[PDB]
């Protein structure tokens, strides 16, 4: 093998400007990193700059360098959608025709009618809200009537809240499984159904750790599956295991924050393993992109950048570091959805003694999967073109 270990980092939602097909999505003008850089009066990301981020595209505070540490380019998304699962599934070698939906005005009556029809229970709420907001508003009615609080977020989720004393936990799980089946329908396709049991009294409701998630498996066997099947290590960090519903995963490390994500990445650098360590840094998307908070987003990017030199110091000659994103989520864009954008790609190993060069633009995110597959000698994905030989 050319590399013994590949460290793949998804900066979640960290897009590098509108894609050629942005108009279809209402995403003309979208530029996640660029708009953040303008807001910050210049982003301070010296380590990403050293890797060649400015060589992909110059932005405020982000300039090109003469000798980038590694190779650089951007990637274009080929799949129909701009959601979490589409982006990640494409990265690991798939092509996804059918996009996962978001519901800023709640779910269609048809879906909620069938859920009522199958459960014999009333549904209340039906809007995007935080757990705290929806329980403050509807928690008491839920307790008193035995109704189900159905809500969503800015992402592709259907969430069902019920008080543990009123709706038995096991009944809530059964209901969520029904909802999971009903939402395997391209009109109502949600990435994730989430059980949100809660306890307490009016004015003091808390969501319990009895939360359960109901995800869909990727629409195909991924490069992760192939790695696992060939007895390679596949270490998933953060939301990665959940995004792939555990498919191809050999170890999963939960994280609480971006900084904690970088700590677990460091933990994997300290592990003897052969295969893939795969990190998702989700805060960019979950805290700042959807909340349209360019200041928080900018600060988060600077906090992440400052962590990189330790990663650089720990990389071995036979290690490869890959840094990319899965879509955009421009914090100055209208609405609360993701934006259809190119994503950066940086590929660095200390064995690149002469530094890196520009790679041809990646025509699908699956080029990452193809590169991983070729490196480890496992079955090549149906989609994607490896850039391994270019490194």
Which residues here bind Mn ion, judged by CB under 5 A? 12, 26-27, 84, 155, 285, 326
349 and 317 in contact (C-beta within 8 Å)?
yes
**207 vs 291 by CB, closer to Mn ion:** 291
Binding residues for Mn(2+): 12, 285, 290, 326-327, 338
Q: Which is nearer to Mn ion, 286 or 388 (CB)?
A: 286
Contacts of 168 (CB under 8 A, 6+ apart): none
> What number of residues does the chain have?
391
Smallest gap from Cβ 377 to Mn ion, in A, equals 29
Q: What's the Cα-to-Cα distance from 8 to each of 1, 74, 188, 225, 322, rounded to whole Å? A: 17, 15, 31, 16, 5
Answer left, alpha or beta for residue 90, where phi above 0 means left and psi between -120 and 50 means alpha: alpha
Question: Based on CB atoms, which residue is closest to Mn ion, 19 or 69?
Answer: 19
C-alpha span between 225 and 378 (Å, rounded) = 10
CB of 218 to Mn ion, least distance (A): 15
CB of residue 242 vs Mn ion: minimum separation in angstroms?
A: 12
Please give the annotated binding residues, written as ranges.
Answer: 12, 285, 290, 326-327, 338
> How far is it, in rounded angstroms, from Cα 21 to Cα 118?
40
Do 32 and 339 meet the contact criterion of CB atoms below 8 Å apart? yes
Cβ distance to Mn ion smaller for residue 195 or 240: 240
Q: With respect to Mn ion, which residue has the nearer C-beta, 226 or 285?
A: 285
Smallest distance, Mn ion to C-beta of residue 81, A: 11
Report the residue number, 172 or 190, with the smaller CB distance to Mn ion.
190
Alpha helices for 57-154 (secondary structure H): 84-91, 109-119, 131-145
User: Burial code of 202-235, b = ≥16 C-beta within 10 A, e = fewer?
Assistant: eeebeeeeeeeebbbebebbbbbbbbbeeebbbb
- The nearest distance, CB 245 to Mn ion, in angstroms, is 16
Distance CA 114, CA 111 (A): 5
Q: How far is the CB of 215 from Mn ion (least distance, A)?
A: 14
């Amino acid at each position: 093998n050319k590399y013994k270990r590949i460290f793949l980092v998804v900066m979640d939602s960290v897009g590098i400007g509108e894609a050629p097909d942005a108009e279809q999505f209402g995403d003309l003008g979208s530029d996640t990193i660029g708009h953040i850089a303008e807001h910050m009066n210049g982003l301070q990301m010296p380590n990403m700059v050293k890797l060649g981020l400015g060589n992909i595209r110059e932005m405020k505070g982000i300039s090109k360098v003469e000798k980038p540490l590694g190779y650089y380019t951007k990637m274009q998304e080929k799949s129909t959608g701009k959601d979490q699962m589409t982006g990640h599934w494409e990265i690991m070698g798939l092509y996804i025709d059918t996009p996962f939906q978001v519901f800023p005005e709640g779910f269609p009556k048809e879906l909620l009618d069938e859920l009522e029809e199958k459960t014999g229970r009333k549904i209340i709420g039906n809007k995007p809200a935080s757990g705290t907001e929806i329980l403050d508003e509807l928690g008491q009615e839920q307790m008193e009537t035995g109704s189900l609080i159905v809500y969503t977020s800015a992402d592709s989720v259907l969430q069902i809240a019920a008080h543990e004393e009123v709706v038995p936990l096991d009944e809530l799980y059964k209901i969520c499984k029904i909802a999971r089946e009903l939402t395997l329908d391209e009109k109502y396709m949600v990435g994730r159904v989430i059980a949100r049991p809660f306890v307490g009294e009016p004015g003091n409701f808390t969501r319990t750790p009895n939360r359960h998630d109901y995800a869909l498996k990727p629409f195909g066997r991924t490069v992760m599956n192939e790695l696992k099947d060939s007895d390679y290590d596949v270490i998933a960090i953060g939301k990665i295991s959940d995004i792939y519903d555990g498919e191809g995963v050999t170890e999963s490390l939960r994280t609480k924050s971006n900084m904690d994500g970088m700590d677990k990445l460091v933990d994997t650098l300290n592990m003897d393993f052969t295969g893939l360590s795969f990190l998702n840094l989700v805060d960019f998307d979950a805290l700042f992109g959807h909340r349209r908070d360019p200041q928080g987003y900018g600060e988060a990017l600077q906090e992440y950048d400052a962590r990189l030199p330790e990663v650089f110091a720990k990389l071995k000659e036979d290690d490869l570091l890959l840094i990319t994103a899965d879509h955009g989520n421009d914090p100055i864009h209208p609405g609360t959805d993701h934006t259809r954008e190119y994503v950066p790609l940086l590929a660095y190993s200390p064995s690149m003694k002469e530094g890196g060069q520009e790679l041809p633009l990646r025509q699908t995110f699956a080029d990452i999967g193809a590169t991983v597959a070729e490196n480890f000698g496992v079955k090549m994905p149906e989609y994607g073109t490896s850039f391994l030989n270019e490194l």
